[PDB]
UniProtKB/Swiss-Prot annotation, chain A:
<comment type="similarity">
    <text>Belongs to the RNA polymerase beta' chain family.</text>
</comment>
<protein>
    <recommendedName>
        <fullName>DNA-directed RNA polymerase subunit beta'</fullName>
    </recommendedName>
</protein>
<comment type="subunit">
    <text>The RNAP catalytic core consists of 2 alpha, 1 beta, 1 beta' and 1 omega subunit. When a sigma factor is associated with the core the holoenzyme is formed, which can initiate transcription.</text>
</comment>
<comment type="function">
    <text>DNA-dependent RNA polymerase catalyzes the transcription of DNA into RNA using the four ribonucleoside triphosphates as substrates.</text>
</comment>
UniProtKB/Swiss-Prot annotation, chain C:
<comment type="similarity">
    <text>Belongs to the sigma-70 factor family. ECF subfamily.</text>
</comment>
<comment type="function">
    <text>Sigma factors are initiation factors that promote the attachment of RNA polymerase to specific initiation sites and are then released. Extracytoplasmic function (ECF) sigma factors are held in an inactive form by a cognate anti-sigma factor (RshA) until released. This sigma factor is involved in heat shock and oxidative stress responses; it positively regulates the expression of itself, sigE, sigB and a number of transcriptional regulators as well as other effectors of heat and oxidative stress, leading to direct and indirect control of up to 25% of the bacterial genome.</text>
</comment>
<feature type="region of interest" description="Sigma-70 factor domain-4">
    <location>
        <begin position="33"/>
        <end position="84"/>
    </location>
</feature>
<protein>
    <recommendedName>
        <fullName>ECF RNA polymerase sigma factor SigH</fullName>
    </recommendedName>
</protein>
<feature type="DNA-binding region" description="H-T-H motif">
    <location>
        <begin position="59"/>
        <end position="78"/>
    </location>
</feature>
<comment type="subunit">
    <text>Interacts transiently with the RNA polymerase catalytic core formed by RpoA, RpoB, RpoC and RpoZ (2 alpha, 1 beta, 1 beta' and 1 omega subunit) to form the RNA polymerase holoenzyme that can initiate transcription. Interacts (affinity=15 nM) 1:1 (via sigma-70 factor domain-4) with RshA under reducing conditions; the complex is disrupted as temperatures rise. Phosphorylation of RshA decreases its interaction with SigH, leading to increased SigH-mediated transcription.</text>
</comment>
Swiss-Prot record, chain D:
<dbReference type="Pfam" id="PF04560">
    <property type="entry name" value="RNA_pol_Rpb2_7"/>
</dbReference>
<keyword id="KW-0808">Transferase</keyword>
<dbReference type="GO" id="GO:0005886">
    <property type="term" value="C:plasma membrane"/>
</dbReference>
<dbReference type="InterPro" id="IPR014724">
    <property type="entry name" value="RNA_pol_RPB2_OB-fold"/>
</dbReference>
<dbReference type="InterPro" id="IPR010243">
    <property type="entry name" value="RNA_pol_bsu_bac"/>
</dbReference>
<dbReference type="InterPro" id="IPR042107">
    <property type="entry name" value="DNA-dir_RNA_pol_bsu_ext_1_sf"/>
</dbReference>
<dbReference type="GO" id="GO:0000428">
    <property type="term" value="C:DNA-directed RNA polymerase complex"/>
</dbReference>
Length: 49, 48, 89, 1137
RNA sequence: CCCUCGA
DNA sequence: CGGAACAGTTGCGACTTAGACGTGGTTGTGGGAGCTGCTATACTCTCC
């Protein structure tokens, strides 16, 4: 049963299991992961960078 | 994966989840214009 | 997370700071004195001085848009500029 | 009466008990540790006093363990000896000003030897500028003063844990072997009945597997361990036998994917545990293991490392443990009880002091330097090498710098007043590297523990999330050389209490019977009662025979911290309010003028001197010259010593550190006498507040519910006024479009507003600045595209060629005012050292006088706090019969249920102290005064007295003194024997119908002040990331409307308010601007748009490879974007084209 | 974020 | 309030450069810090 939940979930059209493996990774816009200069000449970046 | 201080970095999943995540902190709540705060003292002369 | 103090501290040295909705709303309001001064100019001087001193067109392109020789553009730029100088002070 | 300090004000004590031992120097926990690190002569003498092990300093030990540094061929060696410290580079206030580090150069004698030619080269090497501990027990790092908090950790050793919490309801037994530096080793008897082994978190294996791999036969284990039915069951469950298979199975567990090898694995297991390089049990761990397993009775000090006999001893101890045996004897070992260990007991819990932390960092960086020397031995040509070519000191200095910079224990010093700074240096912290995580700290670590008595104060600790994780060293406690805290006790011999003092550790204290200080003794050492309440074994309290008593407390307050010892009538306050009182004293702001309390505990003088914010004469002499700037003392030598005064100095939290001389020209002073008062001191005693006349009564609802009513006298006479100094910093740096310039030329700014700026564009000293005024003018280059079309037209037709700039000038924040008392400027034009890209750096110091006001927070020492709800004209304050108005009105309803009654007792004693008293001795000494000291049988008005904690003024004594209260100038007694007075209503003039309790109470101005609190915003800066307003008052931010606040809006069912808060008041970018546009034009508020945070949510989801679309009713998605023309069309329409 | 603190 | 004629300025476009700055090669040894002092609950995996 627990397996059929997954497989049946993928049975409907427009939805393929192939998406579970990525050949391309998206990149979030830079404003959402910004980089700011600090007092002391150093910089701070989001961990995402 | 840890940055400086052996602090584990915050992934893309960490943005959404947690009390500080997008949903709880930035969506179901926000900071707002036209607001203030201060210490409160008793108002005994005030009407309700 | 980038602290709000870090953002403001960075904006103190920025070319454009952190603008309140108030600033944005006031700047977006029409400047009446400038508008009425521009209205007194002849329409040709108004277009030319507009293009040059606002949009930044060269005399070649301004002449191409206005269908006049470049010399006309020079005369109208100078004369409309002096006109606005006397009008606004 | 604190008679051991010359010139100390006479404060008469109610103490009945005699304290045989003086309070040790309260900074000894700091200075003693660092003096051992340096190997100071003071430490040497004290080492010789305690007896000499051939004592080695902290640095000396690191150098001797490091030496010799040998080539891997043994061809050459390098050794260090005899470290010396040169003079300090700069004085303390110099480093504070110049952003320097208080430091001294470290020199060592490095001797290189060639094992072939026999040639020796002995050199002097400069090891670095060594950060130095100041006279106050602090460090100055990059100009800022810092404190290294002692760390509570678990000492190395062996610890057994019996958990009955298994689901089977059956008990399991665990053990941990913890070294100082090395690999962890865990043994666990299974819930499935198997003895497991975990190595540095590695998965369990039968305990026989490792023992075999150590060279043990499957038979030899049955000889020693056979008595265990569980060890018998484990050897069959052991999958393989033999030393080769065991060592091979061990090397597989450590390295997941590598090949095993026999000689590699045995040398690996040797170097993992039994070798000194990668595994170190300290001497503490060795002795603890020794005493815990009874292995070495002869006290060999030779080597500290685990042994095979230690592994066998550990398993044997654990084996008999789970069986239930109460004792074990090991070959060559004697009579050790088999028992679990208490993790929180202070014999098992250790203190890493500042000297030991710094020493550990020195060992890290020094080992790095060792690695560099080795690599340099192979490359260089011998006879072309001198030590200084081999020695690279960079990783040592860097190692020290990284500690003070990045460590949780190296802390910004808390100086609100001298008391906040003093206890900060006495803090015992459980959080940090080598400690426990805040996430992993259960409620069992935060509890008071019976081993804390006389060691860590049970009262003082935060009430926030840090409760129980931070504590204060008790007044009489010491840190012994092994890191364990000791407390003194009095030898009790044959039921007599002697004056012999012995410092006992927590372990030694459990073997004996210790009587509390409140236990009565007569002139003879005999106890007054045959049964006395004592602590005997593992912290149980019992009525006990006086016949068997070993030791006794040296005094009350022995279990209490410095701040807690300053609470009068502490014994009458519940522990919670007593906690609030200890923490609140360290939040008091220094007043423009100080005043000592009439009612002290006698700790205030010795606290102010040891804190060090008071000036003390190191040598006796005569005052040759005195001014506000300095004091010079001429010693009888003919040598003189001058003390410079700190004048209006800013503390880390913005309070005012100001010293004033208390001595006059010609005065004769002695060594230890206080020359000058500090911020919170008066005549050398800690003065954290004022003595206010207090009446306890509800007054017209303004003191309702902890609110406080004040007399405007306290505003007019500046009794609660304090000085607060802010530091505003600004720098001109290089940007994308050019360099910033600090200038007096600010575009489109009136000359009127620039009037207080000097020629550089910097505000002039002494100017009065209000929010919005320019402190420092600054311009930043602006691009062409950032000009408004109107601004572009004017600059063109008027022929302005000047650089386009924006006004970045530093302005005063909202709700701030003061006088400019100082300026510092650092230029790249000069040689001033600045960070990369920074041309000029300007600091402006503004000082404000803050009068007490509605919303400020006041508190007493008993935990009683409140805001000031109203300040009244002095006339309508209730007043006594002679016309005296009361200073403060505290509500009756807030006293009793808080269970702090000392605030009442103090108030009674405060009045007696204020008016003075004379008891009537004519017929004789009354019975209620029979135990008073003869110096308390009368007192002049404004007498200062001390009621020590747990030896105080008794109820009956305070009651009797209330009868003999002296009259006022008219001969009228204003306060009856109940401590009450008739009061007049200032507003109506009618007398209040019943006598109200009145007296004098000591009240502090706490550092929570309305001026720093009140904040409001219409619109302002927004975060570039989330496009929501910023937050905090400093950033001119908005208030957070959170999840629970939205529940309230939904519960009210107010949809438009909730939508308005979450769209056009916060997120919606076009709406927030259109709303302001509508209010100014007086139109209706526009309909809200889409919050930005939703678009942000969609983008973060896409970045997770989730394809999210907002679908219309058509079923087709919707692009979220804005037409860019609308703004340009309006801008073009504004110019008439 | 962490330190520390207020309700 | 045009269309040439005529005479001052940015401003793009080359090229020399001197130094930061990254590259060649790279051959005796030589395996990290840090921790683990959280509780309680649901449920898939996985050893049996």
């Amino acid at each position: 049963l627990k397996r059929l939940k997954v497989v049946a979930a993928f049975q409907q059209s427009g939805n393929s299991p192939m998406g579970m493996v990525l050949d391309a990774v998206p990149v979030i816009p830079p404003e959402l992961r910004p980089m700011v200069q600090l007092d002391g000449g150093r910089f701070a970046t989001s961990d995402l960078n | 994966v840890t940055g400086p201080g052996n602090r584990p970095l915050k992934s893309l999943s960490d943005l959404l989840k947690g009390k500080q995540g997008r949903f709880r902190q930035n969506l179901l709540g926000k900071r707002v214009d036209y607001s203030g705060r201060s210490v409160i003292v008793v108002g005994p002369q005030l009407k309700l | 997370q980038i602290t709000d103090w870090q953002l403001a501290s960075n904006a103190e040295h920025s070319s454009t700071g952190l603008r309140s909705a108030e600033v944005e709303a006031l700047e977006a309001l029409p400047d009446t004195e400038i508008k009425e001064a521009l209205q007194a100019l002849p329409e040709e001087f108004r277009m030319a001085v507009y293009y040059a001193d606002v949009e930044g067109f060269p005399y070649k392109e301004i002449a191409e848009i206005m269908d006049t020789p470049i010399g006309t553009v020079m005369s109208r730029l100078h004369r409309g500029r002096r006109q606005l100088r006397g009008l606004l002070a | 009466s604190n008679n051991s300090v010359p010139g100390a004000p006479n404060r008469v004590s109610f103490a009945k008990l005699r304290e045989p031992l003086e309070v040790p120097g309260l900074l000894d926990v700091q200075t003693d540790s660092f003096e051992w690190l340096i190997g100071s002569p003071r430490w040497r003498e004290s080492a010789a006093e305690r007896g000499d092990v051939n004592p080695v300093g902290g640095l000396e030990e690191v150098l001797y363990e490091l030496s010799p540094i040998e080539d891997f061929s043994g061809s050459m060696s390098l050794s260090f000896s005899d470290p010396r410290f040169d003079d300090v580079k700069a004085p303390v206030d110099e480093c504070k000003d110049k952003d320097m580090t208080y430091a001294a150069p470290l020199f060592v004698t490095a001797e290189f030897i060639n094992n072939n030619t026999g040639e020796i080269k002995s050199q002097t090497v400069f090891m670095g500028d060594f950060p130095m501990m100041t006279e106050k027990g602090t460090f100055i790092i990059n100009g800022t003063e810092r404190v290294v908090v002692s760390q509570l950790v678990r000492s190395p050793g062996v610890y057994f844990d019996e958990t009955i919490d298994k689901s089977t309801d059956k008990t399991l037994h665990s053990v941990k072997v913890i070294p100082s530096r090395g690999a962890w080793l865990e043994f666990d008897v299974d819930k499935r009945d198997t003895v497991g082994v975990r190595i540095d978190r590695k998965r369990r294996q039968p305990v026989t597997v490792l023992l075999k791999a150590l060279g043990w036969t499957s038979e030899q284990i049955v000889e020693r361990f056979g008595f265990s039915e569980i060890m018998r069951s484990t050897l069959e469950k052991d999958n393989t036998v033999g030393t080769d298979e065991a060592l091979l199975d061990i090397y597989r567990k450590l390295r997941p994917g590598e090949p095993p090898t026999k000689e590699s694995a045995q040398t690996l297991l040797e170097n993992l545990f039994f070798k000194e390089k990668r595994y170190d049990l300290a001497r503490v761990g060795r002795y603890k293991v020794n005493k815990k397993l009874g292995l070495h009775v002869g006290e060999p000090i030779t080597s500290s490392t685990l042994t095979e006999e230690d592994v066998v001893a550990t398993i044997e101890y654990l084996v008999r443990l789970h069986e239930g045996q109460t004792t074990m004897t090991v070959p060559g070992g004697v009579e050790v009880p088999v028992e679990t260990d208490d993790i929180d007991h202070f014999g098992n819990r250790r203190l890493r002091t500042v000297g030991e932390l710094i020493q550990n960092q020195i060992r890290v960086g020094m080992s790095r330097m060792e690695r560099v020397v080795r690599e340099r031995m192979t490359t260089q040509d011998v006879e072309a090498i001198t030590p200084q070519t081999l020695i690279n000191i960079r990783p040592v200095v860097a190692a020290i710098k990284e500690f003070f910079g990045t460590s949780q224990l190296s802390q910004f010093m808390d100086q609100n007043n001298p008391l906040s700074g003093l206890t900060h240096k006495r803090r015992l912290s459980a959080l940090g590297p080598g400690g426990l995580s805040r996430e992993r700290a259960g409620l069992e670590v935060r509890d008071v523990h019976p081993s804390h008595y006389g060691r860590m104060c049970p009262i003082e600790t935060p009430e926030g999330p840090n409760i129980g994780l931070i504590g204060s060293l008790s007044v009489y406690a010491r840190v012994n050389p092994f890191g364990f805290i000791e407390t003194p006790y009095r030898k009790v011999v044959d039921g007599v209490v002697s004056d012999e003092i012995v410092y006992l550790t927590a372990d030694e204290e459990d073997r004996h019977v210790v009587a509390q200080a409140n236990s009565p003794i007569d002139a003879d050492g005999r106890f007054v009662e045959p049964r006395v309440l004592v602590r005997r074994k593992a912290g149980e309290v019992e009525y006990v025979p006086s016949s068997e008593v070993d030791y006794m407390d040296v005094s009350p307050r022995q279990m209490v911290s410095v701040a807690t010892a300053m609470i009068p009538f502490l014994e009458h306050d519940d522990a919670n309010r007593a906690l609030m009182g200890a923490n609140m004293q360290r939040q008091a702001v220094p007043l423009v003028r100080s005043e000592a309390p009439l009612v002290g505990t006698g700790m205030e003088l010795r606290a102010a001197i040891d804190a060090g914010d008071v000036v003390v004469a190191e040598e006796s002499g005569v005052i040759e010259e005195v001014s506000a700037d300095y004091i010079t003392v001429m010693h009888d030598n003919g040598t003189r010593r001058t003390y410079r005064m700190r004048k209006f100095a800013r503390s880390n939290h913005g309070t005012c550190a100001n010293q004033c001389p208390i001595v006059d020209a010609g005065d004769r002073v002695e060594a230890g006498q206080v020359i000058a008062d500090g911020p919170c001191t008066d005549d050398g005693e800690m003065a954290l507040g004022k003595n206010l006349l207090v009446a306890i009564m509800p007054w017209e609802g303004h003191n309702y519910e902890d609110a406080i009513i004040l007399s405007n006298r306290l505003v007019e006479e500046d009794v609660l006024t304090s000085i607060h100094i802010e530091e505003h910093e600004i720098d001109a740096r290089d940007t994308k479009l050019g360099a910033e310039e600090i200038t007096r030329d600010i575009p489109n700014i009136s000359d009127e507003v620039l009037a207080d700026l000097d020629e550089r564009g910097i505000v002039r000293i002494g100017a009065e600045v209000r929010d919005g005024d320019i402190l420092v003018g600054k311009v930043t280059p602006k691009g062409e595209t950032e000009l408004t079309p109107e601004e572009r037209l004017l600059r063109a037709i008027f022929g302005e060629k000047a650089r386009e700039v924006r006004d970045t000038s530093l302005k005063v924040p909202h709700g701030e005012s003061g006088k400019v008392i100082g300026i510092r400027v650092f230029s790249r034009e000069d040689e001033d050292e600045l960070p990369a890209g920074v041309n000029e750096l300007v600091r402006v110091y503004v000082a404000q006088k803050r009068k007490i006001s509605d919303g400020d927070k006041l508190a007493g020492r008993h935990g009683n706090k409140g805001v000031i709800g109203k300040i009244l004209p002095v006339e309508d304050m209730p007043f006594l019969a002679d016309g005296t108005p009361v200073d403060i009105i505290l509500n009756t309803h807030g006293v009793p249920r808080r269970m702090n009654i000392g605030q009442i007792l103090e108030t009674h004693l405060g009045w007696c102290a204020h008016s003075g008293w004379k008891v009537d001795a004519a017929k004789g000494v009354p019975d209620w005064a029979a135990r008073l000291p003869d110096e308390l049988l009368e007192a002049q008005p404004n007498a200062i007295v001390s009621t020590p904690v747990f030896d105080g003024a008794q109820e009956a004594e305070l009651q009797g003194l209330l009868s003999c209260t002296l009259p006022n100038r008219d001969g009228d007694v204003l306060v009856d024997a109940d401590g009450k007075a008739m009061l007049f209503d200032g507003r109506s003039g009618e007398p209040f119908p019943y006598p109200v309790t009145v007296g004098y109470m000591y009240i502090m101005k706490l550092h929570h002040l309305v001026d720093d609190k009140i904040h409001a915003r219409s619109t302002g800066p927004y975060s570039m990331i989330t496009q929501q307003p910023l937050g905090g008052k400093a950033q001119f931010g908005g208030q957070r409307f959170g999840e629970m606040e939205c529940w309230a809006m939904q519960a009210y069912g107010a949809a438009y308010t909730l939508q308005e808060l979450l769209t056009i008041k916060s997120d919606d970018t076009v709406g927030r601007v259109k709303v302001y546009e509508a209010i100014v034009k007086g139109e209706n508020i526009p309909e809200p748009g889409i919050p930005e945070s939703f678009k942000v949510l969609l983008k973060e989801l896409q970045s997770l490879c989730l394809n999210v679309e907002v679908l219309s009713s058509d079923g087709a998605a919707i692009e979220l974007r804005e037409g860019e023309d609308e703004d340009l069309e309006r801008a073009a329409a504004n110019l008439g084209i």
